């Protein structure tokens, strides 16, 4: 399964092993804001002090 993490360009990445979903989170930086990371997944994150996680199961999902 491949999919995503830098986004600017699209251009991805294939998983690595342990790695069978997929994330991304963002940050409560601006009214409005610009996310954080992203990359593929496999529990499902714990969201933060200050952010947010979302995670998928499928390609370029997150």
């Given at each position: 399964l491949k999919c995503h993490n830098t986004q600017?360009?699209?251009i991805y990445k294939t998983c690595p092993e342990?790695?069978?979903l997929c994330f991304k989170?963002?940050?409560k930086?601006?009214?409005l804001k610009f996310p954080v990371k992203?990359?593929?997944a496999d529990n499902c994150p714990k969201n933060s002090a200050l952010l947010?996680?979302?995670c998928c199961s499928t390609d370029?999902?997150?």
């Open positions: 600017l360009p699209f342990g790695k069978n989170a963002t940050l930086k601006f009214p992203r990359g593929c947010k996680y979302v370029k999902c997150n």
